[PDB]
Ligand binder design. Structure first.
Ligand SMILES: COC(=O)c1ccc([C@H]2C(C(C)=O)=C(O)C(=O)N2CCc2c(C)[nH]c3ccccc23)cc1
Ligand SMILES: *[C@@H]1O[C@H](CO)[C@@H](O[C@@H]2O[C@H](CO)[C@@H](O)[C@H](O)[C@H]2NC(C)=O)[C@H](O)[C@H]1NC(C)=O
Ligand SMILES: *[C@@H]1O[C@H](CO)[C@@H](O[C@@H]2O[C@H](CO)[C@@H](O)[C@H](O)[C@H]2NC(C)=O)[C@H](O)[C@H]1NC(C)=O
Ligand SMILES: CC(=O)N[C@@H]1[C@@H](O)[C@H](O)[C@@H](CO)O[C@H]1O
Ligand SMILES: CC(=O)N[C@@H]1[C@@H](O)[C@H](O)[C@@H](CO)O[C@H]1O
Ligand SMILES: *[C@@H]1O[C@H](CO)[C@@H](O)[C@H](O)[C@H]1NC(C)=O
Ligand SMILES: *[C@@H]1O[C@H](CO)[C@@H](O)[C@H](O)[C@H]1NC(C)=O
Lengths: 655, 501, 119
């Protein structure tokens, strides 16, 4: 049978190579069982006439496919659109010998379209593999607004969220822009120092100029770009040591033609033995129909593999991506590029010389340039953090103890000293006690400097979703860590699942539970006087706290929680006084806070014992590089007996 | 000066004769110079040649394109043309009025239609109205389905209700060769509510195979977006009776009304700029030059073509080429196989014509009855502002139809019941897998026949007005001869409470 | 360890072990399949049910918990440090020297040091 295929090129010389390839592939099977022809057209400066010419090419024969290539024109985006749309009307399968834009993969918009070269989006897999190899976890992603940048970012975020790690910071600048120092300035003020670039050549050059002006291209940094950003005028001026990557043998335009014709022949041979010989559309006018077996031909073509291609084994992705093309790692060794390793998209094999980095050093850089000035946020809790006013001399009055050594103190700022009515006022105070001493030991153990301060609301911190919105932002101290106000939390913070979702803790240093305080029938949470509302006994807690979540996390206790929704304190030891004034019947709260005051002052008793047990722990931002050392210090403190000596000092000196 | 391009229809004489003189649409605040264009059987060559000739001949300041339904790859050609000529377009029609998310950077399309996000939000609004909280998803391998598969989950996350979903299934259904695996996959999935995604050329296969595996009875209910049912005029056979879809406003409008609306919006934008006394910008030259390298100060025109309203209808067009925040209605198939309106979505509040879904026509979805008994079942008032009652509480609209001989309708206020018997009912619904709807009774307390006719709960059960009945109901030999009871779950008797001690 | 990990030989009833127990083997090629029951085993069953993974459980041969005789770590800590296993569940406390080479999750049973005397 006479089987006909088509093609479109621009060489007028490699078209001879196309006809030679189709004849040589006809030498593989030529018993007339199927017989192959070949047609061709050239490109034109006008697009509408180009579409009409592809129309007339299509009518010329009973064509089974189309092969389109990139002409000497510099507008590489729209060049294969007039052939794809027109033929896309009749579901005629097409192939792309060389095109990299990531819009042709949207199968809902270009109905029938394939490829033999991976798009610009697939580089994210190579970047992820390199990150896994070199172990750089804190990354910064700088991208553009054009569809290609969004697609690349979406793929990289898909991988990172598949490992549930996320990105340190994502920031994008609109395309065709200049004098954009603001965004690099915004990205400069973080601990993560590896930045990943993807933009056009001119934008790459502009970013290079700005970054070189901002000193951010020297030592301590590593930033690796794609392939579109080390070509042309962008390659002219760039900092030394920029990692990159190039295709296996792309832009040959004649190596892929043999593979295209081979796979087309392999597909058409398998297609022709099917019952439905619809026979491709004939005519560009009047025929307002589709090809009756176009989808079937595309499906068989997709799942047809090749044995020995000049560019390697050929398979197709779910949309026609090249599926395991090679990749070559690059570098900038003093104004001249070089090959450093070959990665096949699954793994990277360094098969070349050593790689130099921007600072000229030879040892591998690590990200997260660790700061030394850390903010700290805490709350007013009696047994742990005492707040006091300072004197006029500038130092809070000294206070010796029976041991023979003084009590450590520090200066804590932040509040108005009057929560209910305060227009605007921040005052300096003094803080001391248990957690402050623990912070003293921690800081002296791991070489750092602290600047303590207090929260702006007074509540511990609890997730909530305000009305007229779909996003929920944490409130109070817990929010302060996420939004960037603080860096660490040295305070009695309990460890619940909801907190553990977005922050990460150290090992616990004090275990406890929840219990009840009563002024000297009251018992645990089983009595009908408690399960049901009655005026004889009234229970309450502190609003916007953990116990609120614990009592809203249980359907079968709804009514009881509702009771708590009626009235509760946004308070402190003030609640202990409200119990003292016979206003409140009983109190339910953490074990240590109640047990200290009960045995400390007078006339108050703890009811029964604990029922729900939990610990106390330091809070730190997600995957911060300090947690391991903090936990190793806490365990060492537990093993020494220092938390024992510290414990008697502050809690066992009572009764 | 504007152009009209009829693409396909039946007898074309009506509109062609109607396009004679600019006395039609003689209410647009500008001088109108219309020109008509006819088009035979459609194909890229015909469209390209026709509109290029019109542009080169007439100095056309805008085009409107009306097309036949069921065409799939027409709008993209229009987008490419408009990008290459930079003259605006507007397709007020059925076929090409399906949104494309990514467009070419320099075009100006102005499609009139909604996306999957807005339709899904309306579908979930109507889904949440009737307590429906479990459903299955079935999607064909039609492309652009991952967008839908993820929009469903995003919108379900957005809402507050639990939204506990059973399963999601991806079928591959087409010509009747590969039609066996989908049968097994459809065989073993069960749910009260289905949300499906397929084209009109594929619903005829999906529903045909569904009617073979027991999934069309009145127990189940279906919801599909507006991509299917393309021929709203004459619905086909094998479709289920009473499936819910959402359609933008003006689904009943006439073709003449549609072209009137298109010319009206274009002229309104033009005259809106004219009030600024700047200009009436001329279009690009022609197709043979490939002109228009950059965007001149003409870019205001396109922008000024967005906010302009008309006749009290918001026509705010998004930067994505589709109109944002319109009014859209819900339709369903009654027992006449012709669509009918159900409820509008004006300003973001759902209206509904039916307070209770009709379920018209083995089975499921049995009705229940109960009345206040103080610990067992408690009837109260709904939320102060919401109306969707507290979690773990069942809506129960009492029937107060005390008179229907000369009474129109009694307003069934949405109360919500909670308690012990309702908890047992919830457990039974979870275990034995049925569906229910409570409604209080208003003829006697429990039942004591007044000389041969029963009343209350037992009366409702005996006269087959309700399948079940739960509450505070005692077992005797007087009524156990008439209805059928369950093994008792509460021990009771007779007791005598005295005053004090 | 009796409160947490209990080993029982399979009964002569039907070959398989009594339900709510897991097959376990004390490796050393020939094997006899005991089955293990306890507290941490219930925790492991729940974990396998929630994290959607599969497991095989085998007892250790050398010293009970761990030590360092000049880098020769025996026990479960050794079996994890030399990459022959992926977890080690049971009566395994936390201290600074262990956590240097083997990671750890959050605690679920809190212990310490205690003195028992005669009443
Ligand atoms: C119209 O649909 C409904 O309104 C409806 C019906 C039942 C339920 C809930 C039920 C509760 C709390 O009422 C659940 O706990 C539960 O298990 N349900 C059904 C589960 C179910 C399965 C698995 N298969 C089904 C087939 C038909 C109907 C239901 C099911 C939820 C909603
Ligand atoms: C096989 O291909 C050749 C060329 O690829 C076809 O011949 C062309 O036919 C068109 C008809 O419009 C002419 O304009 C070209 O000048 C021809 N080219 C050559 C090189 O002859 C030929 O028609 C194809 N075979 C069949 C059966 O159609
Ligand atoms: C409709 O939206 C446009 C913005 O796209 C509004 O603003 C006009 O923007 C152009 C920008 O080129 C200005 O030069 C005009 O001055 C702006 N407004 C006017 C009319 O002067 C426009 O105001 C909006 N119209 C409505 C209905 O509010
Ligand atoms: C190291 C190695 O063999 N990997 C790739 C190989 O898969 C590929 O075929 C070849 C070019 O085709 O480049 C190399
Ligand atoms: C200036 C600075 O922070 N560098 C510190 C130094 O002060 C500290 O004494 C040392 C450990 O003693 O670690 C390093
Ligand atoms: C293209 O590939 C062929 C075959 O590997 C090779 O001989 C040739 O050098 C490559 N480059 C060009 C420009 O042809
Ligand atoms: C953690 O502590 C080790 C020594 O215990 C030290 O070498 C390392 O630099 C510390 N890391 C950080 C981030 O402080």
């Amino acid at each position: 049978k006479i089987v006909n295929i088509g093609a479109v090129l621009s060489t007028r010389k490699h078209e001879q190579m196309f006809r030679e390839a189709v004849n040589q592939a006809n030498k593989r099977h030529g018993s007339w069982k199927i017989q192959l022809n070949a047609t061709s057209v050239t490109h034109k400066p006008n697009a509408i006439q180009m579409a009409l010419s592809v129309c007339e090419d299509l009518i010329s024969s009973q064509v089974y496919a189309i092969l389109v290539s990139h002409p000497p024109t510099p507008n590489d985006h729209f060049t294969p659109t007039p052939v794809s749309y027109t033929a896309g009307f009749y579901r005629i399968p097409v192939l792309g010998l060389t095109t990299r834009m990531s819009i042709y993969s949207d199968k809902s918009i270009h109905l029938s379209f394939l490829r033999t070269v991976p798009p610009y989006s697939h580089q994210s897999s190579v970047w992820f593999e390199m990150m896994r190899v070199y172990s750089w976890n804190h990354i910064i992603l700088l991208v553009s607004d054009d569809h290609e940048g969004r697609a690349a970012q979406k793929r990289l975020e898909t991988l990172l969220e598949e490992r549930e790690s996320k990105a340190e910071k994502v920031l994008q600048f609109d395309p065709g822009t200049k004098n954009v120092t603001a965004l690099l300035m915004e990205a400069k003020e973080l601990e993560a120092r590896v930045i990943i670039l993807s933009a056009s050549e001119d934008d790459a050059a502009t970013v290079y100029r700005a970054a070189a002006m901002l000193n951010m291209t020297g030592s301590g940094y590593v930033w690796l770009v794609g392939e579109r950003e080390i070509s042309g005028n962008a390659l002219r001026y760039a900092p030394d040591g920029i990692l990159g990557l190039q295709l296996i043998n792309g832009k040959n335009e004649s190596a892929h033609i043999s593979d295209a014709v081979g796979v087309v022949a392999q597909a058409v041979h398998e297609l022709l033995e099917k019952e439905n010989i619809t026979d491709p559309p004939r005519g560009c006018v009047g025929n307002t129909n589709i090809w009756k077996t176009g989808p079937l031909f595309k499906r068989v073509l997709m799942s047809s593999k090749y044995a020995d291609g000049v560019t390697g084994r050929v398979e197709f992705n779910e949309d026609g991506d090249r599926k395991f093309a090679n990749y070559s790692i690059m570098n900038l060794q003093n104004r001249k590029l070089v090959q450093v390793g070959i990665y096949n998209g699954t793994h990277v094999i360094p098969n070349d010389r050593k790689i130099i980095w921007p600072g000229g050093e030879t040892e591998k850089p690590r990200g997260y340039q660790m700061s030394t000035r850390l903010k700290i946020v805490t709350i007013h809790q009696e047994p742990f953090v005492y707040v006091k006013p300072t004197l006029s001399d500038g130092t809070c009055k000294e206070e010796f103890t029976v041991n023979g050594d003084p009590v450590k103190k520090v200066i804590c700022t932040g509040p108005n000293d009057t929560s209910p009515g305060s227009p605007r006022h921040t005052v300096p105070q003094c803080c001391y006690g248990f957690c402050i001493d623990l912070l003293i030991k921690l800081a002296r153990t791991m070489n750092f400097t602290y600047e303590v301060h207090l929260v702006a609301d007074g509540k511990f911190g609890t997730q909530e979703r305000v009305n007229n919105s779909n996003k929920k932002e944490w409130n109070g101290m817990m929010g302060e860590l996420l939004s960037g106000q603080a860096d660490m939390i040295v305070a009695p913070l309990t460890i619940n699942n909801e907190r553990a979702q977005y922050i990460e803790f150290s090992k616990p240093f004090k275990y406890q539970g929840l219990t009840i305080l009563v002024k000297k029938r009251i018992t645990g949470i089983n009595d009908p006087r408690l399960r049901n509302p009655s005026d004889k006994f009234i229970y309450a807690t502190v609003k916007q706290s953990s116990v609120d979540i614990y009592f809203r996390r249980q359907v079968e206790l709804s009514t009881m929680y509702r009771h708590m929704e009626k009235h509760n304190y946004e308070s402190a030891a003030e609640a202990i006084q409200a119990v003292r004034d016979n206003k409140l019947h009983a109190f339910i709260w953490d074990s240590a806070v109640l047990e200290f005051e009960a045995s400390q002052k007078c006339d108050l008793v703890t009811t029964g014992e604990l029922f729900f047990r939990s610990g106390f722990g330091i809070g730190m931002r997600k995957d911060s590089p300090w947690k391991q050392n903090v936990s190793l210090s806490i365990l060492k403190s537990h093993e020494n007996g220092f938390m024992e000596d510290l414990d008697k000092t502050w809690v066992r000196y009572q009764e | 000066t504007v152009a009209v391009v009829f693409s396909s229809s039946g007898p074309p004489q009506a509109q062609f004769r109607a396009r004679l003189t600019p006395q039609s649409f003689l209410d647009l605040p500008l001088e109108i110079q219309p020109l008509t264009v006819g088009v035979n059987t459609t194909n890229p060559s015909s469209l390209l040649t026709q509109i290029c000739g019109l542009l080169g001949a007439a100095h056309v300041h805008g085009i409107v394109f009306e097309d036949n339904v069921d065409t799939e790859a027409v709008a993209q050609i229009l987008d490419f043309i408009s990008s290459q000529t930079h003259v605006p377009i507007l397709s007020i029609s059925g076929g090409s009025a399906v949104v494309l998310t990514p467009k070419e950077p320099g075009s100006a399309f102005l499609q009139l239609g909604v996306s999957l996000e807005q339709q899904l939000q309306v579908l979930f609004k109507v889904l949440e109205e009737y307590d429906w909280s479990a459903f299955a998803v079935i999607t064909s391998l039609h492309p652009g389905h991952a967008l839908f598969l993820e929009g469903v989950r995003a919108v379900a996350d957005a809402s507050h209700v639990s939204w506990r979903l059973l399963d999601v299934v991806t079928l591959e259904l087409g010509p009747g060769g590969p039609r066996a695996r989908t049968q097994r996959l459809l065989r073993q999935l069960d749910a009260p509510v289905f949300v499906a995604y397929c084209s009109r050329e594929e619903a005829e296969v999906l529903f045909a195979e569904a009617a073979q595996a027991g999934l069309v009875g009145p127990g189940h209910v279906w919801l599909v977006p507006n991509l299917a049912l393309g021929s709203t005029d004459a619905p086909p056979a094998t479709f289920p009776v009473g499936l819910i879809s959402v359609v933008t406003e003006s689904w009943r409008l006439s073709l003449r009304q549609k072209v009137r609306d298109g010319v009206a919006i274009l002229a309104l934008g033009a005259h809106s700029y004219w009030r600024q006394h700047g200009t009436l910008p001329a279009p690009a030259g022609d197709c043979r030059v490939h002109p228009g390298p950059v965007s001149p100060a003409r870019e205001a025109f396109y922008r000024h073509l967005l906010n302009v309203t008309w006749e009290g209808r918001d026509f705010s067009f998004s930067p994505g080429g589709y109109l944002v925040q319109p009014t859209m209605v819900v339709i369903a198939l009654n027992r006449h196989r012709l669509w009918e309106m159900v409820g509008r979505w004006e300003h973001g509040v759902l209206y509904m014509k039916y307070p209770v879904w009709p379920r018209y026509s083995d089975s499921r979805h049995l009705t229940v009855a109960t009345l206040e008994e103080r610990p067992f079942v408690i009837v109260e008032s709904p939320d102060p502002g919401t109306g969707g009652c507290v979690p773990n509480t069942v809506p129960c609209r009492r029937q107060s139809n005390h008179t229907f001989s000369s009474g129109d309708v009694a307003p069934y206020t949405k109360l919500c019941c909670k308690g012990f018997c309702i908890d047992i009912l919830k457990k039974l619904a979870r275990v034995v897998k049925f569906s229910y709807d409570l409604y209080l009774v208003t003829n006697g307390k429990h039942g004591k026949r007044v000389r041969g006719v029963w009343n209350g709960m037992i009366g409702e059960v005996y006269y087959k007005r309700a399948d079940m009945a739960i509450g505070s109901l005692t077992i005797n030999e007087e009524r156990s001869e008439i209805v059928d009871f369950s093994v008792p779950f509460v021990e009771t008797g007779i007791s005598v409470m005295v005053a004090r001690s």
